């Protein structure tokens, strides 16, 4: 009589507990610096903050009972200790019998794993507290957080396809918008890199936080270009020409992404390289064809940041902000970047 996702969650945590197992404890104690007490501080901190936000109402989200909060939290903790053990056991240093103290002392990894466990639980129960509610509450940078998602998916095989689909979609949210906000640690990472934005060829062939991020971004945008180039079949020659203008705005106009959506720049790219090329001026016709994509929503092309200071639509964003920046690159097409 339980839902499939809730039943699946039962089978996963069955017989386990919200404390580290004996194997995990052995792995903690083999470290020169034993993480166990710091790991407990973090879960206790996250736990208190979670319950506080869970039980306190806002305009958007009504607060709920503390009994349910503890239930959700206890369940997430159980997942955390199961997944952490699996992660540590399968680690290369573990198999080679090397000290893991450095790996286990990174706070951002433990905070992210615990938040992702909370998100799995909330999703299983079809919580009204919708991502990114959990990382907002816990003060987690999207730019740091998303990295844990791949780890979770590969480290827990008991996750249903639906759980896995959801985790992939919240990763896409981070890549398309959330990691690009003005307060994001992304801009800090770009800054220490001397504002050098990795090109497609460079990360698709580096390997820092920046490169791994842009690798994901470039992969996501290419998939969302391909499908849209299956709308008007275009040609695989032009799908490269359009991928070039989009890469140009990412690398040489990174500010245009700030507080914006990846698809806004990809669509704006589309219309322009069409109009300057033999295959030409495919109109907002592709916007209706953009609606077919899973992540497509009205607010994307209806509501676009201009300056902030009001907020206009995609075509106003384009002619105000975009052409000014992208014209002189695009006009020259009266090189080509490789398409993944």
């Amino acid at each position: 009589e339980f839902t499939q996702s809730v039943s699946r969650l039962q089978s996963i945590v069955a017989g386990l507990k919200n404390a580290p197992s004996d194997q995990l404890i052995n792995i903690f104690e083999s470290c020169v610096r034993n993480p166990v007490e710091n790991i407990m501080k973090i879960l206790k901190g996250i736990g208190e903050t979670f319950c506080q936000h869970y039980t306190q109402s806002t305009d958007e989200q009504p607060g709920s009972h503390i009994d349910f909060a503890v239930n959700r939290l206890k369940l997430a903790e159980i997942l955390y200790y199961k997944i952490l053990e699996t992660v540590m056991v399968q680690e290369t240093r573990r198999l080679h019998g090397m000290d893991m103290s450095v790996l286990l002392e990174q706070d951002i990894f433990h905070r992210s794993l615990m938040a992702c466990c909370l998100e799995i639980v909330l999703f299983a129960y079809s919580s009204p507290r919708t991502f990114p509610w959990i990382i907002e509450v816990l003060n987690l940078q999207p730019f740091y957080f998303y990295k844990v998602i791949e780890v979770v998916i590969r480290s827990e095989e008991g996750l249903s396809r639906d759980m896995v689909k959801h985790l992939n979609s919240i990763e896409e949210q981070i890549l398309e918008s959330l990691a690009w906000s003005h307060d994001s640690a992304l801009w800090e990472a770009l800054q220490v890199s001397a504002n050098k934005v990795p090109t497609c060829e460079e990360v698709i062939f580096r390997t820092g936080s920046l490169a791994l991020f842009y690798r994901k971004v470039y992969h996501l945008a290419s998939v969302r270009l391909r499908d849209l180039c299956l709308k008007l079949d275009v040609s695989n020659e032009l799908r490269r020409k359009i991928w070039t203008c989009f890469e140009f705005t990412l690398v040489h106009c990174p500010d245009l992404m700030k507080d914006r959506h990846l698809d806004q720049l990809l669509l704006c790219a589309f219309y322009i390289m069409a109009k300057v090329t033999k295959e030409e001026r495919t109109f907002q016709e592709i916007m209706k064809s953009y609606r077919n994509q899973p992540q497509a929503n009205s607010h994307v092309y209806r509501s676009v940041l201009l300056k902030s200071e009001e907020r206009g639509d995609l075509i106003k964003f384009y002619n105000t902000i975009y052409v000014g920046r992208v014209k002189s690159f695009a006009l020259k097409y009266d090189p080509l970047s490789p398409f993944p």
């Binding site: 219309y271 322009i272 109009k275 907002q284 009205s298 092309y301 209806r302 639509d313 995609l314 075509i315 384009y318 002619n319 052409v323 014209k327 695009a330 006009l331």
Partner: peptide, 13 residues
């Protein structure tokens, strides 16, 4: 050259 101004069809209904 270049701006193509237009009106987004008033929507979604």
């Amino acid at each position: 050259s270049l701006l193509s101004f237009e009106k987004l069809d008033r929507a979604s209904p």
